[PDB]
Amino acid sequence: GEIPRFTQEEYRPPPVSELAAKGTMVGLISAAAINQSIVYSIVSGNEEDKFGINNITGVIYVNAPLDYETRTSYVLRVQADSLEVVLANLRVPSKSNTAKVYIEIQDENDHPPVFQKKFYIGGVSEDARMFASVLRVKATDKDTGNYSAMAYRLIIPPIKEGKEGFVVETYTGLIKTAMLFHNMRRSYFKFQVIATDDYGKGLSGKADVLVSVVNQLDMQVIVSNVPPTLVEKKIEDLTEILDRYVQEQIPGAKVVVESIGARRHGDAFSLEDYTKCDLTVYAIDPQTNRAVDRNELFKFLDGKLLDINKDFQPYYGEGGRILEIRTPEAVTSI
Amino acid sequence: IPRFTQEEYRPPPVSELAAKGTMVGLISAAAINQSIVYSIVSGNEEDKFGINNITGVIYVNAPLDYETRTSYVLRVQADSSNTAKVYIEIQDENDHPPVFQKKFYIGGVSEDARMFASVLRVKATDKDTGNYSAMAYRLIIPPIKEGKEGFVVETYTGLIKTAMLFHNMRRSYFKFQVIATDDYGKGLSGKADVLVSVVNQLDMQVIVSNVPPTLVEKKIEDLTEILDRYVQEQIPGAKVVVESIGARRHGDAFSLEDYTKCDLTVYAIDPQTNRAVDRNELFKFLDGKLLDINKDFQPYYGEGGRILEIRTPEAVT
Ligand SMILES: [Ca+2]
Ligand SMILES: [Ca+2]
Ligand SMILES: [Ca+2]
Ligand SMILES: [Ca+2]
Ligand SMILES: [Ca+2]
Ligand SMILES: [Ca+2]
């Protein structure tokens, strides 16, 4: 009785599609023992019952639905047994031997892109420079590598005279201006952003976008006793805090930062104090597609200054404060 | 027949900086009433490991290097014979400092740059993996009057942005350093120098092209690199800087806009003077080479695409 000898010490067949139908071949197991037939079985690592083996041919096949997102790898032990020979002149025992089979599941593209928000709200000022950042979008999905790697594009209604309105950076999701908005205050643009995985060759998802056009008549200046570099470094967290206070008055409103600068003061606001900060903001109301009235915005922030200062404390440091809210100086200078 | 404690061994990863004699793992087999001796029978061609034939302790025998080889598969043998596989993985250590892609970055700002306007993007890399080549960036800027910070850098992206206004500072400049530190700021460091020079409209020229500004903007990095080559054959190390990309302006006082065509406003900084190249010289370098520049722009602009002219922006009309 020869102990069965596999063709390989271990098996590493090619990856198996997570969308493989039942009966799909995974790979071949082969062993021989001189003058004896061989039978194949699976002895361990097949607890989930995802594979079977044809006990005569040694073909490992898919037995049940697979899912890369539940399990990526399997390590099976297959066993080969020679069959007994009990004849008048030959008596050969059954003998067994095992071998490891490393099976890897191949990720397929079975999850479409999902945007982190269904509705993105932004704004642009009348004096925004060409290619100024408006907002950044992001879609993800549960697939791996290329199958959740996004290409972004915009679907925007026609604009006359070769103007495109906005563009999106194809791989980063950054939406930027593509025209000037002089004299367009109170206009607004509604459009869609599409994410397509496999860098634009796979599945797609979408989100809506509103960009409202404002100018200084829509804005308020938050004056803080900390440098503009601190405010700018933390601006995402600060804006999220301000959104909460505006949103308890105007549901779904989005606060937008126009600029962050030194505190301006003195005659004609001509002096700059870099130890302090002027943060110019507005808010867009998705109910109107336009900016919140700047006097209402003043009331929402000025009325809550103590609470806002408390929420800013971890960012500004203790004794960091909003000093005041004021109307932009170029407006009042009229 | 000697029976191992395990069918195969997968000990923990071994530091690529492991000293000789460092333990990798233990191999153990028993055969009743008989002593056991251990050897390494295969996969140790490079001689990186040894085994104590009595204790079964596998140890580091020579210098390792994750950047040359990450994995080893040894076959160990126990005699009183039988064998077993040992899968050894090398752990990447942080032994390459950050290296900036350029040693000297040159940029500019206009007198009317808005606060936190993008200036330029830096990037350092190194041969380590994962966290050990993942960069945190910071700036070291010589003192500026009135406590001004000058510029900031986005900690993980390398984008350098303005942090003050530059009104009336034309022909002033800032020399400073950017530091990259791997392991997100807790590991090794490298640096590069940065020059940012201050200009205004008196330093600029407008490249007028027969393609939309959206096309120019998409390709701006390659276009700027082509323009650098033409300026650099006249002024060594000069850097072309893009001030803006817009519709082609025309009509009275250049008040009208044509979005089918493009005005690309540029200037150049000369690292010899730390200041802008004279705008009339810049005009000669570009206008004199328009045919050659148009040939190099062809793959970007597409069929029939060209620079139409260079014009000088003027405040008084
Ligand atoms: Ca799946
Ligand atoms: Ca998948
Ligand atoms: Ca996908
Ligand atoms: Ca190394
Ligand atoms: Ca390393
Ligand atoms: Ca490193």
d(CA B180, CA B138): 7
Q: In chain B, what are the helix, strand and coil shares in percent, each to the nearest 5?
A: 20, 40, 40
d(CA B108, CA B99): 23
What the block records as the tokens of A170 is 């194809």
In this structure, which amino acid lies at residue B225? E
Q: Which residues pair with A271 in a beta bridge?
A: A265
Question: Considering every ligand atom, which ligand is closest to the CA of A204?
Answer: 3
Is there a binding annotation on residue B132? Answer: yes
Longest dimension (CA), chain B: 107
- Whether the CB-CB separation of A16 and A106 falls below 8 Å is answered with yes
Residues of chain B contacting A161 with CB distance shorter than 8 Å: 259
- Whether the CB-CB separation of B71 and B90 falls below 8 Å is answered with yes
Q: How far, rounded to the nearest angstrom, does the alpha carbon of residue B147 sit from its chain's CA centroid?
A: 30
DSSP assignment, residue A20?
P
Q: How far is the CA of B98 from the centre of ligand 5 (A)?
A: 12
d(CA A26, CA A60): 5
Cβ within 8 Å, pair B244-A129:
yes
Closest CA to B181 of B107, B142, B131, B141: B131
Is there a binding annotation on residue B270? Answer: no
SS3 B197: strand
Is there a binding annotation on residue A81? Answer: no
Is there a binding annotation on residue B292? Answer: no
Closest residue on chain A to B152 (Cα): A229
| Angle, CA A292 vertex, CA A286 and CA A293 arms, to 5° | 150
Gaps in chain B after residue (C–N beyond 2.5 Å): 80
- Whether the CB-CB separation of B163 and B149 falls below 8 Å is answered with yes
| Angle, CA B2 vertex, CA A80 and CA B48 arms, to 5° | 95
Cβ within 8 Å, pair A228-B163:
yes
**Third-level CATH fold of A114-211:** Immunoglobulin-like (2.60.40)
- Cβ count within 10 A of residue A305: 16
| Angle, CA B120 vertex, CA B118 and CA B125 arms, to 5° | 130
Longest dimension (CA), chain A: 119
In this structure, which amino acid lies at residue A141? D
Find where tokens 């460092």 sit: B22
Decide which of 1.20.120.160, 2.60.40.60, 3.30.750.24, 2.40.128.20 is the CATH code for A5-106: 2.60.40.60
Method: X-ray
Residues of chain A contacting B115 with CB distance shorter than 8 Å: 228, 232, 259-262
Question: Cα dihedral sign for B291, B293, B296, B302?
Answer: negative
Determine whether domain B3-91 maps to CATH 3.30.70.260: no
- Whether the CB-CB separation of A131 and A184 falls below 8 Å is answered with no
Decide which of 1.10.287.130, 2.30.40.10, 2.60.40.60, 3.40.50.620 is the CATH code for B99-199: 2.60.40.60
Resolution in A: 2.1
Cβ within 8 Å, pair B149-A227:
yes
Residues of chain B contacting A163 with CB distance shorter than 8 Å: 259
d(CA B299, CA B85): 56
d(CA A284, CA A282): 7
Residues of A with CB under 8 A from a CB of B: 129-131, 161-164, 167, 178-180, 227-229, 232-233, 259-262, 272, 274-275
- Whether the CB-CB separation of A169 and A176 falls below 8 Å is answered with yes
In this structure, which amino acid lies at residue A164? E
- Cβ count within 10 A of residue A97: 16
Closest CA to B5 of B47, B41, B36: B36
Q: How far is the CA of A145 from the centre of ligand 1 (A)?
A: 14
d(CA B279, CA B201): 10
- Cβ count within 10 A of residue A232: 20
Q: How far, rounded to the nearest angstrom, does the alpha carbon of residue A162 sit from its chain's CA centroid?
A: 32
Closest CA to B297 of B289, B282, B307: B307
What the block records as the tokens of A131 is 């290619």
Buried b (16+ CB within 10 A) or exposed e, B231-249: beeebeebbbbbbebbbbb
Which stretch of DSSP H or E encloses residue B95?
A: none
Q: Please report, to the nearest 10 degrees, the dihedral formed by the alpha carbons of residues A62, A64, A65, A66 taken in order.
A: -50
Which residues have C-beta within 8 Å of that of residue B36, sequence separation ≥ 6? B2, B29, B30, B56, B78, B79, B80
Nearest to A163 among B147, B149, B259 (CB): B259
Residues of chain B contacting A12 with CB distance shorter than 8 Å: none
What the block records as the tokens of B253 is 């006082």
d(CA B274, CA B197): 6
Q: Round the CA-based radius of gyration of chain A to a whole number and report it.
A: 33
d(CA A3, CA B1): 15
SS3 B30: strand
Q: Please report, to the nearest 10 degrees, the dihedral formed by the alpha carbons of residues A293, A295, A296, A298 taken in order.
A: 120
What the block records as the tokens of A5 is 């000898």
What the block records as the tokens of A195 is 């994410």
What the block records as the tokens of A139 is 């879609």
Q: What are phi and psi of B134, to 5 degrees?
A: -100, 120
SS3 B295: helix
d(CA A263, CA B63): 59
